[PDB]
Symmetry: C3
Subunit: 248 residues, 3 copies
Amino acid sequence: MFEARLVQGSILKKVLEALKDLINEACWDISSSGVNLQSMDSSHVSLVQLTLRSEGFDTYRCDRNLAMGVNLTSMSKILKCAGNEDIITLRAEDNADTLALVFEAPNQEKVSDYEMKLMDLDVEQLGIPEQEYSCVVKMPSGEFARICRDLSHIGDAVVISCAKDGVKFSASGELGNGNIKLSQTEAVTIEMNEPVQLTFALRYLNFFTKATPLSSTVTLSMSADVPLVVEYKIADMGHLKYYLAPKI
Amino acid sequence: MFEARLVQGSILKKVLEALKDLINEACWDISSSGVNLQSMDSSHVSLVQLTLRSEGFDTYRCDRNLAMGVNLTSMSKILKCAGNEDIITLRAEDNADTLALVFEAPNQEKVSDYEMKLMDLDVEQLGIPEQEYSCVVKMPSGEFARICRDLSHIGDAVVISCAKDGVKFSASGELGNGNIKLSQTEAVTIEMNEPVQLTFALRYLNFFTKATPLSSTVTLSMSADVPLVVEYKIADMGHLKYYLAPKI
Amino acid sequence: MFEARLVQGSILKKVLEALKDLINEACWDISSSGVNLQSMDSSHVSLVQLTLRSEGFDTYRCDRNLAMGVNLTSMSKILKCAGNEDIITLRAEDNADTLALVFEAPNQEKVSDYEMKLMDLDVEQLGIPEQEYSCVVKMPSGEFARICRDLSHIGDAVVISCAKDGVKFSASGELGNGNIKLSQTEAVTIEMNEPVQLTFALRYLNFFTKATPLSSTVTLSMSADVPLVVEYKIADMGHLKYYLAPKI
Ligand SMILES: N[C@@H](Cc1cc(I)c(Oc2ccc(O)c(I)c2)c(I)c1)C(=O)O
Ligand SMILES: N[C@@H](Cc1cc(I)c(Oc2ccc(O)c(I)c2)c(I)c1)C(=O)O
Ligand SMILES: N[C@@H](Cc1cc(I)c(Oc2ccc(O)c(I)c2)c(I)c1)C(=O)O
Ligand SMILES: [Cl-]
Ligand SMILES: [Cl-]
Ligand SMILES: [Cl-]
């Protein structure tokens, strides 16, 4: 008998806006500890992982663990019916076939309730390994978004080169090439053990940056021979992480 | 020798913006009492009725009654050439083949004049019956627009249920369903003799809401077995009314 | 060994935004005196001429005269990677095959450098004759843009009639016709020896007005039997001029 009330409901709005173009359908793993989503994107390239801890909700209750199969476009459409000031409650019965979503304001003059048909998805839980990241860059999320958008007018791929002093983003294509150098100082901070130079598809990074509204900061974690992790903190609640294998 | 000067010319701009998607061609009935338009929309579903009383114009003169056949897209295009601060004069000769439109500002530094070819439309005047509306809801026009837009992402039709205490808008479709409850308190006011529950096509309501800029308030009048009336007041001048039969 | 530093880099951004829809490819004539571009548009109708004098750059150096063949769409794409506050340096070696563009800010926290492949274009320099313009209209660039946009909803051509007292823009098409009268007074100023009445394609004027951000003023120079000149000053630096033959 799952139920979860989130006074800052706009977090859910932004979460769906940051998932709906990447994933068509995904399983929401609901448990005592919180809400978790894990899915490969629809092209089977990147893996997206969302954590929303029970403690970041204003009320939270989960009697039995649920795997809720959700069409993300549908859920996105329903969440567009919530205002940015709305208190949002999620509610599903045991062995649920629908998810209820209730939107309200403090003044209770407008109350909306939606019911979303769930899907049957017997998806398996993938193991996400832990890695030693020889290089971790924290920077303003908006500057990251800007760089990925700008450089995708030049080529399809971005070389990210990281050293103690600064981080460089480079691209090349038909028209020529470019590179963008950010020095360490919102700040740019680099925690690095060994320099890395890795190449990534801009198409996928430009999908990840739809998470920009969740945080003014993004963390890029990278190491040779493992996926890049692009991490947006969801304040006092958890995170959205995107994983992208370098181009080999 | 029709002539009409409207210092608040932006009213005409908004009137055309609220008609041009619904109607291709329509007759402007000009008479001593004022300007009236009546037309079925281009799909022959809803009826639109505009009243602009002679008294709301700053000057007004009509020697002989005229039926001006107008392509509304064309008139819309000409009215887009008026600024929002413009004084607008309409002028047509007796047995007119063209309508003149003059746009000016107080400072007279820019004066525009347009001439629009009229059309030949021998359309008959339809009788719009009077009805007893067992239920009349006054609410903010923007909230009405929001609800119709939001709910049309859920289904094609909206059930409007009205009672003393409040008004509910519901929709259902493939993805699931939703309902939006507004309580009586811009306010929400309900004057009702008997509860109504009626169903309407959202496609047409979303056309009516293009009239939103004419008023901060909309009036919904409904009764069993007669069209819904969606009414936008045009301050100190008249109205724009849209009529839509429930789905049966 | 050409190099040019422009602290107000946004001038270059606006220059490219005012050329890229009109011209695909064009030669940048670089010399001691400054940067000049001359090209027929891609339809071979209008001629565009850009002058940026060496003196308007913060530093300027040109060892040998260069004709740089540039795809303007490509250069436009690179200049979109510059911020509006950016210092912009252009750099090309002798007998250059690439153009370097460096973007920086005062605080040097972000430095970008791009390299653009040049093209081989053995275009000849066209002689632009001098003419006696019997009529010169100075007016606000935004009002010019407004008029050309508005009137292009009425017809494809604009009749520009100029007299001592004022300037009139007229258009006619299927729906009817219109004219817009501006009186002499940002001001409207007319210096005229003889009245002119000339007709011009609105499609091309609406391309010229993409230069609007370079200046709050536009100068229209016209005479019977020679092209209209539409001139946008590039403050303390030079100009962008567009030439358009009247319709005959
Ligand atoms: N589904 C894909 C395989 C695939 C599986 C997983 I688990 C992924 O996530 C991570 C995350 C962090 C890591 O360090 C690693 I190593 C992998 C990704 I990116 C791809 C296929 O079909 O090959
Ligand atoms: N033209 C349509 C018929 C049609 C005629 C009329 I008059 C209409 O307006 C109203 C307005 C208020 C009312 O109470 C009623 I009853 C009808 C409408 I909506 C439709 C056809 O072809 O059947
Ligand atoms: N390229 C075109 C010819 C063409 C050549 C030139 I030089 C042009 O510029 C001007 C500018 C100011 C003037 O007074 C004149 I006279 C011409 C233009 I407009 C057109 C063709 O192929 O016929
Ligand atoms: Cl991988
Ligand atoms: Cl009816
Ligand atoms: Cl010519």
